[PDB]
Design a protein around this ligand. Structure first.
Ligand code: JMG
Ligand code: JMG
Ligand code: JMG
Length: 284
């Protein structure tokens, strides 16, 4: 079926939970043996969210190459994403090592450091220009260059220096700051505006390594971001845009990381975002 009318049909019939459970039942199951090794227990935030062995990002280190991060490679859309958990106190250096080694231009953050009165990820970037951060375990230096605070999101320019080689690179940090503590946003307009700002920066384009996107577990809000982006790109590429099937795209992405889209409300929000986005792209 098309998307916008499938949408009103699910709303009128109140069957979002049944649609979502079908997705969960059909999703891929692949091994995640490296994630479960005892030496990696303090490298995982949640025991039930792990990268598959076949798609996990490897650190260029011979001691321990493990990070909780996955490469999502969308062949028809010609887009790739790295989805990862929010960094932990003992993985902030690994996180920036990955950004460096994978040649990423941008980092997309969809959570606040504290939500619901608890810490959802480490404070992993510097908050003042004159107070830079040094990660001694991976030999990197990180400096805040500029910050632009808007009503729904903040963009930061960061300088990452590899202290071994003295090479430097400019990294863009895109921080969506207004996702509610509970539920999903009422309108997708600010989320879509944010996606378009990430696109306009070059961070999603083939001349760079894959964008790094995270929330707290790296599967819920993060899944919504890449699912909406890929669906909108396919609608622009195909002769028949009404052939794009958001449930089939989501099952393809779940071949590369488990659990993408955590609730039926997140699934409904993803449909809403793609539907509204397809009108702005042209023109209705
Ligand atoms: O950790 C493991 O060894 C596994 C996890 C999942 C496995 C599996 C088995 C049959 C079909 C599809 C997956 S095996
Ligand atoms: O040194 C540390 O930070 C840690 C040591 C052990 C940790 C752990 C975490 C989850 C489950 C079992 C152990 S974290
Ligand atoms: O009948 C339908 O579902 C559609 C008609 C046109 C669509 C479209 C979407 C994005 C970009 C260009 C066209 S989707």
């Amino acid at each position: 079926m098309e998307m916008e009318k499938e949408f009103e049909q699910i709303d009128k019939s109140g069957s979002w939970a049944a649609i979502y459970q079908d997705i969960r039942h059909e999703a891929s199951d692949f091994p995640s043996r490296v994630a479960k090794l005892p030496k990696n227990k303090n490298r995982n935030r949640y025991r039930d969210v792990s990268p598959f062995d076949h798609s996990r990002i490897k650190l260029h280190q011979e001691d321990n190459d493990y990070i909780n991060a996955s490469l999502i490679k969308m062949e028809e859309a010609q887009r790739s994403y790295i989805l990862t958990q929010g960094p932990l106190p003992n993985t902030v250096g690994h996180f920036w090592e990955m950004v460096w080694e994978q040649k990423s231009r941008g980092v997309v953050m969809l959570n606040r450091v504290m939500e619901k009165g608890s810490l959802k990820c480490a404070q992993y970037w510097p908050q003042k220009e004159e107070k830079e951060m040094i990660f001694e375990d991976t030999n990197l230096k990180l400096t805040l260059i500029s910050e632009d605070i808007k009503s729904y999101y903040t963009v930061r320019q960061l300088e990452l220096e590899n202290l071994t080689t003295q090479e430097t690179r400019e990294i863009l940090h895109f921080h969506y700051t207004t996702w509610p503590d509970f539920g999903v946003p009422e309108s997708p307009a600010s989320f879509l505006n944010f996606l378009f700002k990430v696109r306009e920066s070059g961070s999603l384009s083939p001349e760079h390594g894959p964008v790094v996107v995270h929330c707290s577990a790296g599967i819920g809000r993060s899944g919504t971001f890449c699912l909406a982006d890929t669906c909108l790109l396919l609608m622009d590429k195909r002769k028949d845009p009404s052939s794009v099937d958001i449930k089939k795209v989501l099952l393809e992405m779940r071949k590369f990381r488990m659990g993408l889209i955590q609730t039926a409300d997140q699934l409904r929000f993803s449909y809403l975002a793609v539907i509204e986005g397809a009108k702005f792209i042209m023109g209705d």
